[PDB]
RNA sequence: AUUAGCUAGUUGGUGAGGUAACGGCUCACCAAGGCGACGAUGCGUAGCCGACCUGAGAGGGUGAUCGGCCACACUGGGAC
RNA sequence: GGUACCUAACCAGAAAGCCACGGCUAACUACGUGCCAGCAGCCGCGGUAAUACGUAGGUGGCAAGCGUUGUCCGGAAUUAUUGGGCGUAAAGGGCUCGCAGGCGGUUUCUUAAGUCUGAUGUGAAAGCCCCCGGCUCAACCGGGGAGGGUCAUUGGAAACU
């Protein structure tokens, strides 16, 4: 599945890293710009974008963003349960709070939360720093996270005896 | 009325080479504070005898007396099962 | 050898389910007899029923895949493990997941899941959660 | 496994040295011995005041103190400031201050103490360097 | 000798004690047996709650009360029924 | 000097008026008029806090206390906050009319007295009971910025009542969740205590 | 534990003395016992707790005043 | 102690400073300085165009306080049971046999040491937490609760160790 470009998406530049290249004539620059893109109502994904400006590889990143989206469960404003995000020595841990806590995360995982527009929830980052690695540490967690209807009509039961 | 039970203890002889008197081990064991896993744990003690009754290997139950001697403070009460 | 059956049972399950196999085959044993009867109950596979021998029996499972070929169970743990075995109170019984996953409780009314455990008031040996 | 490793092996901690081994070291005089105390200053008397070079290869020319401290120890010192009437056999207050640019010296020599005149000429940040409000 | 007490609390200048059974040995402010009611000197009606069930057995099994004790006691009339406890 | 400099610092006035944005709202000092750069994701909250301490005009020890307060009491913690700020009676006091600037509120209740169920009331934290009527005594009964504050109409809000005649207000029960923000965007402030 | 053996009135018994008491509490006699890897012995360090600080939690640090118990009164010993 | 308080009359007059402004981190410009003078918690800055050195204006934080020092806890998932690792980053003993110790195939009766759960007895007061009352909110001071045992006696259950 692909999420069509019917929506209104703001985009929160996380992050701009030099980059550059070693050739016979000296070093050889460019840019390299990671940015999370998403509605507030639940559509997010990230993007990155290489060249040698940075307003037009920020340009490539927000259409790579755009290209790749990804839903998430919103169950009352908040994530439904715990989860740990498992990418590549990323370690985030996710616990849904009461409703108004507010958002407590890092940097760039408070980034992609409040892009996400989670209104109350609390995190943890337990892995390396590295701030993609974060982001595709979190954002496996979030697609891991499950809705309580699908989970009932899997085991063939009702939400009533689920939360029961 | 009837008055306070002494406590009563469980274990087995560790010595008998003293006349009228008799040691026996107690096998009461706790788990770990901070762990929570149990563990084995051994408490010796200096019980009284009248005729050199308990033998070692024997397991004797135990009640607790006023201080008989230094170091002893238990008497004998019954030899529940004797060795091989 | 091989150090407790439950372990073994939760594994096998797993290993299966991360593949897709439709059958398995658990030695039989009264205790994970009754473990399979509640995982059934609970709707967590699609059926199970035995076959009996001389060495312990075997008991064979049917796991469920969903409507679209998705996983019903995505994970299980053993937590009262040989040589650390962990015992809940009736009060701090967890409730896996706030809901939606189960843990399986031994109770001195027999062994029970966590909802109703937490309902009739038991605690006891809390040995697994299914996700 | 590993719990019964833990039950008997134990779980070591690190230890955290202290970072101002002088600063924490008392002594007294008709018991002949170096106690141990928590003291956030000390005071002592310069045995020697002169001025030498740092290590890293860009330099700067500073001042310093090696001072004689109430308990006994021997260990040099920073002057931070423009200027001083730091003269040898002053008695001089103590702090703990580290200068990375000059290797060895542990402490700072605060100002504003006994013998250390306030840097003059100076309108920001004069609490520290110890200067009283230039005007009435 | 045991003795019901009045024992100090409150701030620098708001005393506020409470009714207590002590030793004459043990201090103002230290142990005690147990606490019996409180007293409030500076509210502009004096003020005062007692129990007259296990704070009474005291003065059943002897107990002198200190002179304001005493006399709140009175104020209450729990030595009063004390009192007719004998001929009682 | 506070006034000005601390509304178009924030940008937004403290108590809302074309003044203090009419021709220089951008900020204080020679760098003002130039490019304003996005502030950092911790200068964002900072600015809340700044813009609700100084809105309200209170400490910071206040307002830490203030904030615990809330978070212990019940409901949300992202607006029971906000209710003890209103249910400061200089808040109160300001919003019946009373006065023109919330800097006249704190001055006249600080020296001047404003009776409400009690003889004489400086800490602000205070609030007339309602069910009872109690009023401002018979010495500034009369006042020059009183008569201004009560001619000069000002929409007292829904849980205030007040009556000029005798210019004494009961306060209703609890404020609504419409003068919660009014344009402040709270749940800012829970996470840049929580840091 | 870069502190492996310590103990020889200490270990047990029979008698006799001895605060208010039971007791190697002290003697006489008899006997090789007692304790240690689950850390004895030794060295260093410290009054103990209610509690206090931090930490969401496990946990980690502190033992000021307020309260309880303990020991000391220039240093040792002694009894009235 | 004529102290707390109440009653009057006089005056904007007696009563604002501390630190930071390259990034971490909220706040920038002008001058002098020219590996000097100096700065500092880290990165690091300064060798004549320094937002990092000293001044000046302004801004930023806080306020009868503000910075520095020293000690402890967090951040430190950096001794990790809760909550870590050991092929090349630190880490599998050179290998084996085995005392003690740690673990234990399936069914079935029984025992209740572990286990789970009632009852009772305590876990002083004062503290932290909840709910009320009072010092002109409270700081504080009261009143009533709750919590606080790898706790003692006793009863109940037998799935698991």
Redesign the interface.
Do not use: D, S
């Given at each position: 599945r692909i999420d069509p470009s019917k929506l209104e998406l703001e985009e929160r530049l996380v992050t701009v890293n030099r980059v550059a290249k070693v050739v016979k004539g000296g070093r050889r620059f460019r840019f390299a710009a990671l940015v999370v893109v998403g509605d507030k109502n639940g559509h997010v994904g990230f993007g990155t974008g290489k060249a040698q400006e940075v307003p037009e590889a920020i340009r490539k990143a927000v259409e790579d963003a755009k290209k790749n989206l990804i839903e998430v469960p919103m169950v009352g404003t908040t994530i439904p349960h715990e989860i740990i995000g498992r990418f590549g020595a990323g370690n985030i841990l996710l616990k849904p709070a009461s409703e108004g806590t507010g958002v407590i995360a890092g940097g760039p995982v408070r980034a992609v939360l409040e892009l996400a527009g989670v209104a109350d929830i609390l995190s943890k980052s337990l892995g390396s720093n590295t701030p993609i690695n974060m982001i595709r540490a979190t954002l496996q967690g979030l697609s891991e996270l499950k809705r309580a209807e699908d989970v009932a009509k899997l085991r063939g039961k009702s939400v009533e005896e689920l939360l029961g | 009325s009837e008055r306070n039970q002494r406590k009563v203890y469980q274990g087995r002889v560790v010595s008998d080479k003293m006349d009228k008197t008799i040691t026996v081990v107690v096998e009461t064991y706790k788990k770990h504070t901070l762990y929570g896993k149990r563990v084995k744990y051994s408490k010796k003690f200096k019980a009284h005898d009248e005729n050199n009754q308990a033998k070692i290997g024997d397991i004797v139950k135990i009640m607790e007396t006023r201080p008989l001697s230094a170091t002893k403070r238990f008497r004998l009460v019954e030899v529940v099962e004797e060795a091989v | 050898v091989m150090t407790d059956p439950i372990a073994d049972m939760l594994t096998r399950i797993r290993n299966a389910n991360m593949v897709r196999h439709e059958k398995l085959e658990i030695p039989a044993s009264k205790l994970k007899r009754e473990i399979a009867e509640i995982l059934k109950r609970?709707?967590?596979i699609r059926d199970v029923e035995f076959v009996e021998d001389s060495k312990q029996g075997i008991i064979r499972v049917f796991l469920?895949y969903?409507?679209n070929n998705?996983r019903?169970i995505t994970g299980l743990k053993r937590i009262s493990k040989p040589?650390?075995?962990?015992y809940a109170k009736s009060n701090e019984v967890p409730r896996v997941?706030?809901?939606?996953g189960i843990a399986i409780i031994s109770t001195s009314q027999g062994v029970l899941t966590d909802?109703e455990a937490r309902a009739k008031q038991a605690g006891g040996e809390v040995l697994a959660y299914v996700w | 496994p590993t719990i019964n490793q833990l039950i008997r092996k134990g779980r070591v901690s690190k230890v955290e040295n202290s970072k101002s081994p002088a600063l924490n070291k008392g002594y007294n005089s008709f018991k002949k011995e170096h106690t141990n105390v928590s003291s956030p200053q000390k005071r002592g008397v310069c045995t020697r005041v002169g001025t030498m070079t740092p290590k890293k290869p860009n330099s700067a020319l500073r001042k310093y103190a090696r001072v004689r401290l109430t308990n006994g120890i021997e260990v040099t010192a920073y002057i931070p400031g423009i200027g001083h009437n730091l003269q040898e056999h002053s008695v001089v207050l103590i702090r703990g201050g580290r200068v990375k640019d000059l290797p060895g010296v542990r402490y700072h020599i605060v100002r504003g103490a006994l013998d250390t005149a306030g840097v003059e000429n100076r309108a920001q940040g004069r609490s520290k360097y110890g200067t009283k409000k230039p005007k009435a | 000798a045991v003795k019901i007490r009045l024992k100090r609390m409150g701030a620098k200048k708001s005393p506020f004690y409470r009714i207590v059974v002590a030793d004459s040995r043990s201090p103002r402010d230290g142990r005690f047996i147990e606490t019996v009611g409180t007293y409030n000197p500076v509210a502009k009606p004096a003020e005062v709650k007692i129990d007259e069930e296990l704070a009474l057995k005291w003065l059943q099994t002897g107990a002198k009360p200190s002179d304001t004790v005493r006399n709140l006691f009175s104020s209450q009339g729990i030595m009063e029924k004390f009192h007719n406890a004998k001929q009682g | 000097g506070p006034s000005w400099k601390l509304s178009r610092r924030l940008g937004i006035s403290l108590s809302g008026t074309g003044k203090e944005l009419e021709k220089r709202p951008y900020a204080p000092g020679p760098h003002g008029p130039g490019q304003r750069k996005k502030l950092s994701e911790y200068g964002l909250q900072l600015q809340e806090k700044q813009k609700l301490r100084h809105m309200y005009g209170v400490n910071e020890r206040q307002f830490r206390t203030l904030f615990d307060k809330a978070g212990k009491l019940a409901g949300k913690h992202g607006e029971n906050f906000m209710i003890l700020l209103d249910s400061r009676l200089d808040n109160v006091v300001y919003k019946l009319g009373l006065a023109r600037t919330r800097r006249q509120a704190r001055q006249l209740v600080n020296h001047g007295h404003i009776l409400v169920d009690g003889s004489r009331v400086d800490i602000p934290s205070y609030l007339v009971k309602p069910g009872q009527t109690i009023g401002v005594r018979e010495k500034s009964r009369n006042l020059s910025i009183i008569k201004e504050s009560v001619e000069v109409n000002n929409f007292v809000p829904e849980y205030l009542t007040f009556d000029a005649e005798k210019l004494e207000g009961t306060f209703t029960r609890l404020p609504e969740r419409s003068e919660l923000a009014p344009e402040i965007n709270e749940a800012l402030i829970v996470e840049f205590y929580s840091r």
């Open positions: - | - | 609970e709707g967590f469920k969903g409507q998705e019903v040589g650390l075995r962990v997941l706030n809901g939606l909802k | - | - | -």
